[PDB]
Design a protein around this ligand. Structure first.
Ligand SMILES: CC(C)(C)C(=O)Nc1nnc(S(N)(=O)=O)s1
Ligand SMILES: [Zn+2]
Length: 257
């Protein structure tokens, strides 16, 4: 099964998921000087006030904080998007060292981690249908750098002990994802894919320019998670990031000059 090891990592995924070599794969390097400001891009509308988190799950590749997406409670709109995209889950990708971990890069710079807030286009009714559409998902990507703690992340950090191993979940209600956002909603956007198998080319990527800062202690706790299940040899959940993929016939657009 696919993963992030030497024998099952990103360089192997194409054998089971040939789209791994597709025309709109993610992540990509964001070359800031080549991205073009698009004055027609609207500001993002992040409407998370009514978000209902439910559960946090270690799925063996990352941990997902899941939301009630059976109504328009937490939605992403605007920016490059047409229509309404419902928040379904967020998760992170992170490194074994602070100098790596993000999936997108900025002028080849890797951040310590990257947060993905995943939303699906409500016009497709369910996420399973949405992922079969070129505009099915919108993922808001937020870089993490190590410095000051992010207070709004601590509730996530502190539950990780209870989901150390693959397949463990814990109740995770009343978490406010607004506490994970940076000040600015300036962003880059481009059409891409899921960065994990099945690598479907269904994502409008919206990557915020402003990273959030998290503390070394916060990211160290991410790195204590396990890829393995309980009672199996311990493999630390670290470096669960896919590297940058060829941009091919795509232009990255910037919301800001
Ligand atoms: C909801 C559903 C489709 C199961 C999902 O979100 N799957 C993801 N698979 N990779 C993602 S990434 N790293 O591109 O945000 S999201
Ligand atoms: Zn992701």
């Amino acid at each position: 099964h696919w993963g992030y090891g030497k024998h099952n990592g990103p360089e192997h995924w194409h054998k089971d998921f040939p789209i791994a070599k597709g025309e709109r794969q993610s992540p990509v390097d964001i070359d800031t000087h080549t991205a073009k400001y698009d004055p027609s891009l609207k500001p993002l509308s992040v409407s998370y006030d009514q978000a209902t988190s439910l559960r946090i799950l270690n799925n063996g590749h990352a941990f997902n904080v899941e939301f009630d997406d059976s109504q328009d409670k937490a939605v992403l709109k605007g920016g490059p998007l047409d229509g309404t995209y419902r928040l379904i889950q967020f998760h992170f990708h992170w490194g074994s060292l602070d100098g790596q971990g993000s999936e997108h890069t900025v002028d080849k710079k890797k951040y310590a981690a990257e947060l993905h807030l995943v939303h699906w286009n409500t016009k497709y009714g369910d996420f399973g249908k949405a992922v079969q559409q070129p505009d099915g998902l919108a993922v808001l990507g937020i870089f993490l750098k190590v410095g000051s703690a992010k207070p709004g992340l601590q509730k996530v950090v502190d539950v990780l002990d209870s989901i150390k191993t693959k397949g463990k979940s814990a109740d995770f209600t009343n978490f406010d994802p607004r506490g994970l956002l940076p000040e600015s909603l300036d962003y880059w956007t481009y059409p891409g894919s899921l960065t994990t198998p099945p690598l479907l080319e269904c994502v409008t990527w919206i990557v915020l320019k402003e990273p959030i800062s998290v503390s070394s202690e916060q990211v160290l706790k991410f790195r204590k998670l396990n890829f393995n299940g309980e009672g199996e040899p311990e493999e630390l959940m670290v470096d669960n990031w896919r590297p940058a993929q060829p941009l091919k016939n795509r232009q990255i657009k910037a919301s800001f000059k």
